Paper text:
Respiratory chains are crucial for cellular energy conversion and consist of multi‐subunit complexes that can assemble into supercomplexes. In mammalian cells, the mitochondrial respiratory chain (MRC) is formed by four distinct complexes (CI–CIV) (Lobo‐Jarne & Ugalde, 2018). Three major models have been proposed for the structural organization of the MRC: the solid‐state, the liquid‐state (fluid), and the plasticity model (Acín‐Pérez et al, 2008; Milenkovic et al, 2017; Lobo‐Jarne & Ugalde, 2018).
Additional improvement of the CIV subunits was built using the 3.41 Å (FSC = 0.143) density map.
Residue numbers in the entry:
A (entry chain a): 5 to 534
B (entry chain i): 2 to 53
C (entry chain f): 47 to 145
D (entry chain d): 30 to 146
E (entry chain b): 16 to 251
F (entry chain k): 16 to 129
G (entry chain g): 3 to 57
H (entry chain j): 6 to 83
The structure:
Amino acid sequence: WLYSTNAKDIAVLYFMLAIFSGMAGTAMSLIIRLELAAPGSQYLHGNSQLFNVLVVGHAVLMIFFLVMPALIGGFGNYLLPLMIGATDTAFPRINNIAFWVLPMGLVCLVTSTLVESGAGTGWTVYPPLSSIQAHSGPSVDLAIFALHLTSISSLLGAINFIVTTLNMRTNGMTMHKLPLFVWSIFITAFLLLLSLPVLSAGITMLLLDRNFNTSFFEVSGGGDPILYEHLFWFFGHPEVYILIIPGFGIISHVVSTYSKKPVFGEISMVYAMASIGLLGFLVWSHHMYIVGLDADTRAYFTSATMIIAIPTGIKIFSWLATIHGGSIRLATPMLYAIAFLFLFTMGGLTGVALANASLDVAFHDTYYVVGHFHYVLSMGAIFSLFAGYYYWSPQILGLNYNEKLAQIQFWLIFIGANVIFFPMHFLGINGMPRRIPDYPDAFAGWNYVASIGSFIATLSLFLFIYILYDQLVNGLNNKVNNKSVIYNKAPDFVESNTIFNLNTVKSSSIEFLLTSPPAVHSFNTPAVQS
Amino acid sequence: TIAPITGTIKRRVIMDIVLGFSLGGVMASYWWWGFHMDKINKREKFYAELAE
Amino acid sequence: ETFEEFTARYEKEFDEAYDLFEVQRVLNNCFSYDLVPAPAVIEKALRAARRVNDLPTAIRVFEALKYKVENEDQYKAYLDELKDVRQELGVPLKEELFP
Amino acid sequence: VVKTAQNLAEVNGPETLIGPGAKEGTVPTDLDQETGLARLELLGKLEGIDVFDTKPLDSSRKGTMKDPIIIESYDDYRYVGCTGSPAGSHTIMWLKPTVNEVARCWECGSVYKLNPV
Amino acid sequence: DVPTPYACYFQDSATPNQEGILELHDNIMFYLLVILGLVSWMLYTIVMTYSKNPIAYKYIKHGQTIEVIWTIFPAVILLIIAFPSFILLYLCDEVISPAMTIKAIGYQWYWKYEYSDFINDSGETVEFESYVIPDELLEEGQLRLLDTDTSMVVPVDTHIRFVVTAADVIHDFAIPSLGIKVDATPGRLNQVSALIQREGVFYGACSELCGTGHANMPIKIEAVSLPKFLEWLNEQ
Amino acid sequence: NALKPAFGPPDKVAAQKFKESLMATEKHAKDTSNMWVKISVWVALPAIALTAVNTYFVEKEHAEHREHLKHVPDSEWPRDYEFMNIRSKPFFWGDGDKTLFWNPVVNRHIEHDD
Amino acid sequence: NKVIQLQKIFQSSTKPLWWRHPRSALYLYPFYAIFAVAVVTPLLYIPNAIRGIKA
Amino acid sequence: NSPLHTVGFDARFPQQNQTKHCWQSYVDYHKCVNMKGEDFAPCKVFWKTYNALCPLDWIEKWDDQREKGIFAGDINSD
Amino acid sequence: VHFKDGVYENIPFKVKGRKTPYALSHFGFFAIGFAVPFVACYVQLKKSGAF
Amino acid sequence: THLERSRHQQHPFHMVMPSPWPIVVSFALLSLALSTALTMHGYIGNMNMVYLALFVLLTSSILWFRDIVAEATYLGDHTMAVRKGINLGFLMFVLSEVLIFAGLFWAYFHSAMSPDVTLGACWPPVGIEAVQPTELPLLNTIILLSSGATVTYSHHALIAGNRNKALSGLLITFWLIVIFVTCQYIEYTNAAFTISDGVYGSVFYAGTGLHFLHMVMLAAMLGVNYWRMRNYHLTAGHHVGYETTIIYTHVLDVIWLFLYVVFYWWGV
Amino acid sequence: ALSNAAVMDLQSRWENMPSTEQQDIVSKLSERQKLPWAQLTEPEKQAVWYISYGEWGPRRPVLNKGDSSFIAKGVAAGLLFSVGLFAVVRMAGGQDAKTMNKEWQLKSDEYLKSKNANPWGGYSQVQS
Amino acid sequence: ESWVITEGRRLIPEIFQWSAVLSVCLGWPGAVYFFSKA
Ligand code: HEA
Ligand code: HEA
Ligand code: CUA
Ligand SMILES: [Cu+2]
Ligand SMILES: [Zn+2]
């Protein structure tokens, strides 16, 4: 419905924007890797603009319009009232404006590309390239009004999430007895509250330099452009952990469900997940190790970036101990979660070498960084986004999803996306710079190998669309015959099959005990816990 | 009289971490003693000639 | 916490079962611990199937005893210690049934 | 003649929760200018009884099928979390004890009869 | 130096301040293989030998003696890694005794070097600009997008201090073989120090984005011998 | 009848404890109204009316200093620095209007190309 | 003053809430006029400004 | 037999950013030649410093700022 | 969707009972989201003279 | 009992009715963002489309507040658990409003602790005549300091039970947030350095320019509380539209006391 | 008692048994187990094990018998279609690089070997 | 007198299957280089 205030109809409007914009985030990802398959400007004619335009069109659409409105918006607004037993969210109307300002932020981005210049600044919109002396058009003004409309989407959803799980939980649910996915959006809604004013100041200080020539960062005037480097990345690394703490929430539940065991040391899992967000503020200069910082400052930021391996490493070793003792039911959400423990591990170790200030001088703005963050974004924040769909969509929509067709969609993602991003470390370790339209002739090797895998990942997205179509049409027929899997938890070894049908769902959370799909007033009387 | 049988999985993580360090340890000994000492031997053989 | 304190915790729970649900539940978290129990525990589990009159929940005892035994000879020593209780009741092994 | 409540026992729905008139030249004293939902909880706070239930459930006994645990509701799907018999025994497990069908707590063993109201 | 097609490693070293980076990166990845060995072996014993286990050991939650172990054990690994890192970070900015100063200013699509120390016989600061030779004006044998026309030369076995800045948008000064990278912010000017151990050409690239032609400016550095250096310097 | 006994037992002691905590709501708001009314009219307002005319004592001479500036035309203006008038993308609401508001007496923007 | 009478109107009317006051016909009928003007004229200037024709 | 020679450490500016090492040496050269140039040798030591590590578009910039009397830093000690 | 909860009712689509095939309005929604960069690839290249 | 008790809610939380204000505000921000980034590069000719798009955003937000005032005293679903939510929901909004000034405090300290080479070694740069703190900016403080000392008896006399005392303390508080707007408008016209005079005219006219913009929002928030107290809305025990504004009043008398000690006393 | 023709081979007969008989044979069975065991019929003793712990409904595997051979027959027909879809757009594309075609690389080494570029490793540069 | 072999019967095909799947999951760029050196 159009101006509805129901807190779970907004969450499906969120999810009709992720897969829309994630398609355009992939089609812009297609053209970039198609142009980079061979030396010489093949498909683009000679234009290096429209390549630096389709990089910021691809990085904004995938971060601010795919992973953020689906992890924080999609699975946030649907499951944060449900798993705490709230009837709706706390402020229901500003939950609606947190959605509808995103398609207006979608219009302000596509109209930033059609205007004659095109934002050729990269995702980090650096000041003297995006000052009015270089980009004279109104293109990048619309490209930061899109980041203004997205910032007030994620801010006004984060205020709604803090004050939901602080007083709208049910009777016996204290803060210690909370689900891990509720704690994960509760930590994340504090970082969105404590980093977006730093972005929305630093973006506005860039808008005032162009249209009002106030010289916040213009050099003729003493405006140092390293201030924007400090100001953007104080948002930028908290923004990085905001896309991955809900990634840690869903994996903490798919593992605990498809392996019939509780999470190993749950109260020590929440401490490690909260000490990422507190430690995430104390590092931002590891994106600018080589701008000219003094040696004692580089010695600090190489230590405080190494400390983040401690609480993240606790969470990986806790997930290994959870699936160890118990049974394992290898359905397709468990396949996405069991590959999250490997691909986020290899993308976390690559950041450890990058965290050294004395080693980053041979790695900054090479493809060793681009091969690093895709192993924790296109495999950390997307695998958990795919796992979050296949674990809950028979409950949300009410229709099963043709399980044996979903197995090959995972397998074409895992062997598909690994063909792109694994040779990307080889281009950066040899010296290929970042954001180049075409490369020197000695880089035609792995740029051809990493271009075949772009079509394996894109065909996987097209196979996901047919699964998304086969779940809707004849989705009811998939739970009356032997296509899909119905019960996520098979009975125990001494459970009778006629006694399993009395007590079916052995869930440790509310959202599987509701009707499928849940009603519009799912709690007209409060639930009680222990 | 059946003797009391216990601890069948406590012996399956002590004998699994040990075979996890000794399976990456002889994966990392090839890197530093068989690959890093391959390139650094080619360096100080080549730089031995450029004093002559 | 102990092993003899594990027996006299489950020698009681199979003496208050009254129902099929409270036998298959108590048998479920009798094998879901670390150790496999002594046969003094598993004797009550067979006896508590006659309290509720259900045969295949007394067959899965000897099917779960085979999996959680850690050594093939010990499966032949649990069966040999259960000389009479398998024979007085009459529940057979699953392999002898060959289903 | 809708006749506002002035006590909890006489409500008869939202027609009689209007409250009396406001005096001129003074503040509203919060008893004469309420509306009908915060008016109802104000009448509860003027008595001892709290209107909205905030109580964790009975977690002192286990309860067999001969002697279950009753959970007073206003519908037929009051969700129950039964983390243990001293309320710290096992992990949580959520149940939906509906009318004429109890829930049975596959881990712990408690029985929950609805008593729907 | 020259990148190789289908390569997987660094380029060949030319600087002891880059020779330490190769010693640091191999010492770091020596410890990132034990951890990847431990993770990927635990993720195959658990997946194989517990997808068939029907009875789930659902009564182990705390593990007190193993949570303390994986708290200090990443703390021991990162403390071992830091001491090669803290030595190399300090000992890469020893600018105590240089011998020649080179400036390098990037004019948004091309570089401009100037050896402004009056050390030659003419009496002026020698300066020139270096553009990439275009695709029309190529000659058969050049390295495309890597080989410019009028390169920068330096002596060997002598300490040289670069001074890198710009008078336009921010863009980087990067050579992978010497291991130097300073982003050249136009309000300021950074400096690096790196002597070259062996003569020969080194190629580099510009890594920070500057606009349209971000790729079309390499930094050709051909270190020559010192009596051959002063022949070029007194001439040009 | 069926399904209709009552609602809940009267606690009957929270009342005359919650209402007894609400009788002190007025009793505490009487003194803290009296504590702040004396400081806002006999402490803070003596600081207002004493220094507002002190501030209006320098207004009559600093506007006179503004009257000094346009008294002489002074085409020999001090030739302001490189940063004093940034004009990349000149302003869109006005012709050569520097800000949203500026008096012309002290914001002349005299161009000296020479 | 006028609050208890407005309690009798806004409760038990079954109209949309923003319409419920009697003094609302001359609020939204001008507001829906000047909102439909101010939302299309930014969109109408879009395809001319893409080509590059300004004032 | 050691021809090449330039500016040493100058420990008051030890870090990587040398944007004021160019500047402070430039002012101290123009402070010397105005305020009691004792000879042209013992304050052209500054002239050897700022001719290095200062771009030749920066030197003509401050030469214009001191030409029109609009230079930022104080060079007139008198 | 504020009333009439059901299996196909909580979605702003209209899956069953459609006058047209649904796969028109499903794949014709994502191809709009997939060909929206190519129209930005078109009109920016066409503005730059080349075709 | 159980018949009349079943004719109400069971949870204290308020379920709002669907209303088309969060969509119309969303079509007012798009028509603002499009009309702004067009008119700054020509493309329109006059400043009329911004003057209407900013006007329709102001009207479509004052009609959102027309619903919440009716939802709180004409239907009145703000219970004890809802009022804790609004008081805590605003308290998270004011945290971002405080931290948005940390971006304009970092900008000053990055431009004053390490002084620049393009301007002089000093701070403020040479030629720019800075604002003296022993003048009218001190009058901007003592007016604002007493404003936080005259709204806090207008709140206490509201609970005490007299309108004429609590209304007099709000009228002379609303004038203090329009004297401070006026005396920071007079100073913004009798200064000597513009928005485009380097950085000292830039970081100064954004850390105080944004604070001047919030005082218009505080004087409007102090305006509806005078309208509601005259029209008999705020009770003696239920006022969340007033306890919200006292938080906004004291927090703006905190960040001004950082603006005064940094941009005036520490600057000169 | 109960007929031997009723529960004989209750492995394939339980699926596609009608629903009103499927819950009828257990009601005939569950009355009979109130007796001392090893008096039951030997195919009847098998048949109660398929009801309580069989592979039907619940305890069905996540993948059937013909799924692991179907998963590998959809992945390898997705690789050998994506690379087939790779060559089609690789055909309809721009002109190749000028310097890539193998004639530069025979003598760009002579530029490199004259200057001693890569002393270890390799400067071979020959990719066609 | 038994327990070393009953783990040794399982772990010895485990450490061989693991290196078989790790050398494909990590060493697969060694295959594309070996064929087409061109
Ligand atoms: C959100 C994070 C994210 C994700 C997922 C991706 C995904 C991908 N990215 Fe991107 N990328 C960035 C963030 C991301 N990227 C950033 C920040 C930059 C840097 C910009 C700059 O340098 O400034 C960048 C830059 C970047 C470059 C530029 C390198 C250079 O600068 O020259 C390249 C080129 O190779 C690239 C490729 C890819 C590819 C092939 C994918 C593939 O993984 C895409 C295919 C994967 C999918 C098929 C799955 C997702 C699709 C869905 C719709 C999800 C559906 C699931 C649910 C909703 C249930 N990316
Ligand atoms: C969103 C996902 C995400 C996540 C989770 C991370 C996590 C980390 N990132 Fe990364 N990173 C990005 C995405 C992400 N990053 C992006 C988008 C960029 C910038 C690109 C651009 O500039 O446009 C970036 C940039 C970036 C840089 C800047 C390089 C450059 O641009 O010059 C650095 C360097 O310090 C870095 C490091 C790290 C580290 C140390 C972690 C750590 O948190 C990781 C912790 C994980 C582990 C360490 C593995 C688990 C641990 C073990 C198995 C057990 C413990 C073992 C030992 C201690 C050895 N990241
Ligand atoms: Cu200069 Cu990129
Ligand atoms: Cu980072
Ligand atoms: Zn229980």
